[PDB]
């Protein structure tokens, strides 16, 4: 049966999607047991069960348990890991019931929706059914199917034999790479490709290929790590991360893995001192949008691309499936495939559309939303299906599009898009209460502008603001972005008010993330905005010093509350920086506190509170002095805060701790 078919698959170097749809116990569990025994690419298979750590390894056969919930990113990542002949068994609920399935049963994975209870996500199911149904490639086994026909397999059955599967890199390694010429030999190369293309392996070759003594010595850097393992394993590779990397200049050829992830400022400086190989993943989950990639490239570039996967043969139906399901395809930035495409000429028109557009397939259909998705996704530094699922099923998702000429069914492409995500009642609706003063902040509703993007050909038209206005047009609106003097004014010009400036530079952008709100209702939202804004005002000195970068908080622009915050750190989980900065409530408290503010009290981890807050001593340093095991430091800081408050006012603190 399928075991014969499995033999064909590994020979072809392809993988297939096996869908088990039915009762949880019936089709799903028992069949999985049977399949494990039966399907033996090798004896059986590894059959890793998924219901990030996994990538370096590969496995024969795996199971994805969507019965309750479907996390698409996980599905895509899992596929990339599977070896040749492997089967990805997708466990689904009863097929008839699946679309509606999700409600009480719900898509548990609804961590995209994040309503109190999980919901249906019909649209996603519909898209899924479309791709699945389209061709014969995926095997659908439904319960109540006494016998399932298996196209392909032993005997004559459907599956046209691919050639036995078993040059692109070689053409690339030294070869395109021999950078010597009238033009400079030293320059920057940028190889980009989808996952599993061999970018790393390609990057590894150059390491030895250049020999310490001989061709030359190399170097390597990367963002939050990324699998450094393949490149070096394929590799003198040594690794100092970019920031630490900023130290001294030894090497002839630098290689940076997925540089798009690294801050423009840091990246640019580094590229100047040497010759580099720039690698970046695109067209997949956790890849980088090609729209952004161009802007990034422009900053320079000799760019090259690799088309074929090392792990499987091209045309692998499993991979095609995920790409289509996930909407991996990039085409809109260069051009649309139609008479129109590429720049979007004409007068830009602002309009809104609902999620419902998702089901209908006619004018305003899957296509319109799909096009919007491609544009926003394309413009982001990182791409993720969570975004896609949210767009499809999540409630509280609203879109506005800026489109070029519209007339007949087919017209030119969209110039811009705005995606609003209601939030309230992640990012603007999780933190305002953890980071802000009102415990209640989480209760209201607002729409975060998760993503806004204007086609690069069209930018600086005012379409961006036009998009926002349309959003407001017919408690508040919010946005969180990496702070830039430039971006802030855009939002300020938008009518946003600066809410918060956090502590940690965006790992990717390198700028600190700020939050702003555009007050829609006066009842409490302008109140929360103003109150936070005022709080930030008090905090301003604290933040600037704390920043290290010590950037002053302009924000979009040219106490009893403290007691509550303080109690929250002392009595509860609120983090140190939230209370702390140079002097938010925490430093404020140290100034007042007679206690050990100094060697022990104040506000922070070290002298427990003071040495970190005042001194800026390291966590490790005070752990030794204080003789704490680590983690315990925070506990001590909290305890120190509690002590100071009690000294100040015993009765007040007791009540606060209580409620």
């Amino acid at each position: 049966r399928i075991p014969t078919l499995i033999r064909n698959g590994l020979q072809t170097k392809k993988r297939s999607f096996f869908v088990v749809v039915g009762d949880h116990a019936k089709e799903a569990i028992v069949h999985l047991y049977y399949i494990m025994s039966s399907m033996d690419v090798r004896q059986n298979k590894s059959v890793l069960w998924a219901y990030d750590k996994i990538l370096g390894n590969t496995y024969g056969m795996c199971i994805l348990q969507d019965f309750e919930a479907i996390t698409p990113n996980i599905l895509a990542r899992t596929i990339e890991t599977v070896e040749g002949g492997g089967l990805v068994v997708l466990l689904l609920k009863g097929m008839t019931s699946l679309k509606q399935l999700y409600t009480m049963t719900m898509d548990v994975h609804a961590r995209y929706r994040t309503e109190a209870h999980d919901d249906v996500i019909a649209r996603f199911n519909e898209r899924f059914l479309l791709s699945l149904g389209s061709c014969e490639s995926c095997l659908v086994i439904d319960d109540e199917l006494n016998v399932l026909p298996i196209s392909g397999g032993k005997g004559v059955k459907p599956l046209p034999p691919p050639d036995e599967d078993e040059v692109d890199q070689a053409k690339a390694l030294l070869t395109f790479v021999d950078a010597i010429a009238e033009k400079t030999l030293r320059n920057t190369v940028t190889l980009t490709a989808a996952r599993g293309r061999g970018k790393s392996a390609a990057m590894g070759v150059a390491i030895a290929a250049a020999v310490a003594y001989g061709y030359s010595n190399i170097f390597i850097t990367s963002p939050s790590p990324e699998n450094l393992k393949t490149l070096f394993e394929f590799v003198t590779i040594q690794y100092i991360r970019p920031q630490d990397a900023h130290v001294l200049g030894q090497a002839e050829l630098v290689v940076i893995d997925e540089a798009a992830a690294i801050p423009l400022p840091l990246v640019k400086k580094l590229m100047g001192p040497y010759l580099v190989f720039m690698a970046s993943t695109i067209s997949g989950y956790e890849g980088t949008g090609r729209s952004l990639s161009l802007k990034l490239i422009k900053q320079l570039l000799k760019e090259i691309t690799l088309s074929e996967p090392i792990r499987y043969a091209q045309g692998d139906n499993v991979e095609k499936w995920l790409n289509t399901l996930l909407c991996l395809d990039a085409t809109l930035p260069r051009s649309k495939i139609s008479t129109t495409g590429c720049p979007d000429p004409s007068q830009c028109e602002l309009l809104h559309v609902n999620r419902d557009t998702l089901f209908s397939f006619h004018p305003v259909s899957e296509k319109f939303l799909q096009q919007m998705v491609a544009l926003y996704v394309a413009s982001h530094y990182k791409n993720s299906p969570n975004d896609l699922q949210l767009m499809s099923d999540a409630p509280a998702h609203e879109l506005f599009v800026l489109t070029g000429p519209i007339q007949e069914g087919r017209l030119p492409e969209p110039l811009c898009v705005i995606q609003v995500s209601l939030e309230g009642k992640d990012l603007i609706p999780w933190l305002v209460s953890q980071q802000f003063q009102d415990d209640e902040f989480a209760s209201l509703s607002g729409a975060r502008i998760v993503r806004i993007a204007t086609n690069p050909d069209y930018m600086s038209m005012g379409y961006g603001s036009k998009a926002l206005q349309l959003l407001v047009d017919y408690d508040y609106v919010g946005v969180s972005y990496g702070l830039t003097q430039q971006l802030h004014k855009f939002w300020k010009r938008a009518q946003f008010v600066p809410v918060y400036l956090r502590q940690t530079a965006n790992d990717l952008t390198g700028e600190h993330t700020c939050v702003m709100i555009r007050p829609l209702q006066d009842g409490n939202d302008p109140s929360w905005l103003g109150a936070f804004a005022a709080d930030f005002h008090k905090r301003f000195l604290s933040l600037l010093s704390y920043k290290f970068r010590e950037f002053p908080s302009i924000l979009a622009l040219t106490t009893p509350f403290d007691h509550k915050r303080l109690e929250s750190y002392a009595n509860g989980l609120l983090d140190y920086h939230v209370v702390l900065d140079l002097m938010p409530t925490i430093a404020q408290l140290y100034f007042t506190g007679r206690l050990r503010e100094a060697v022990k009290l104040s506000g922070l981890q070290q002298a427990i509170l003071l040495a970190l807050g005042l001194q800026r001593k390291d966590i490790d340093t005070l752990a030794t002095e204080l003789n704490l095991p680590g983690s315990q430091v925070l506990a001590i800081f909290m305890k120190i805060m509690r002590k100071v408050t009690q000294h100040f006012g015993a009765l007040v603190s007791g009540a606060i701790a209580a409620e």
């Binding site: 009595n571 989980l573 925070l634």
Partner: protein, 49 residues
């Protein structure tokens, strides 16, 4: 950190998955059977011990 939270009084066995790091940070360096202030879970646990 997954949680197997039991409720004496009634006999309520529930399981909670808490992925975000920041919340669980309060359980770190605490001893067995200590008094937990489940407000580092502003969610469904508003004022719990």
């Amino acid at each position: 950190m997954k949680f197997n939270i039991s409720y004496p009084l009634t006999g309520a066995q529930k399981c909670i998955e808490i992925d975000d790091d920041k919340k669980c940070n309060i359980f770190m360096d605490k001893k067995m059977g200590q008094e937990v202030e489940g407000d580092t879970l502003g969610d469904e646990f508003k004022g719990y011990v």
